[model samples]
Target: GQVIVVRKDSDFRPKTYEDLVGKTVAVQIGTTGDIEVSKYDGIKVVRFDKFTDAFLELKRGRADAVVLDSATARAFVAKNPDLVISSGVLSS
Candidate 1:
């Protein structure tokens, strides 16, 4: 499973752990997001070697939520406006 991660949203929204439950999440290896996602049950953790790959996975429906930096997620969502990020942090 991936680790837990945190990042401030474009609107400065804080992403928390409670926001991740039951979501199919993705994270890069060795990140705080990787550490955190490993703890939750029912939350699917998809690991990728690169952040870009993780984003791609999200775009492809391979993952639901990406437990990564909000900046990265924003970049992805910007290119693919169909995706929406929840307003909360990825907590442990």
Candidate 2:
């Protein structure tokens, strides 16, 4: 599995991990993205009960972005054109 960063289409694209610094990132509780993103400095990780809720956080701007698995990210992005993958796939 791979992790990917998602942001609103209106936001600037994130090209690297450093680009996420100081941003609020949403993740599903206990998931790989939650654990991995927590290790990064200056990133505020918001926990959600469900992965879908994490996307909602991004939608509402409560979260600057979302960190989730590639497959699920693709599905969510497909469903919501306002959201887009801002970074390349990342391995944990």
Candidate 3:
């Protein structure tokens, strides 16, 4: 639960772990983000082999958000203007 970034104009920026309920979330396989999402039953979790594909899924409207590491999340946001990291931290 490092970070969850939303796509531009998606009008959804989840602020808590519970807020993800019923939302479509993307994550890389075998990552911390993947495990975290698995703990939430109502979430529509999409596991991808690559973070790039996960981010693309988020950007393409296939998914509502992307759960990933902070550095990679920020890096992707910096590389693309269409994404913004949520302010919430899923874990302390």
Best by TM-score: 3
- For lDDT, the strongest prediction is 3
Q: For candidate 3, give the lDDT of residue 57.
A: 94
Question: Please, what are the lDDT tens digits per residue for candidate 1 over residues 32-71?
Answer: 7777777777667889899778766766766665677667
**After superposition, which runs of candidate 2 have C-alpha atoms over 4 Å from their true positions?**
none
Candidate 1 global lDDT = 0.62
lDDT digits (tens) for residues 1-92 of candidate 2? 54555656565677666677888889999988888888889988889999999988888878888888889888878989878887778655
- How much lDDT does each candidate structure score? 0.62, 0.80, 0.86
lDDT, candidate 3, 1-92, per-residue tens: 39888987877878766778899999999999998888987999999999999999988989988888888888889988899997566672
Looking at model 1, report the run of 10 residues with the lowest lDDT sum. 1-10
TM-score, each model?
Answer: 0.65, 0.88, 0.92
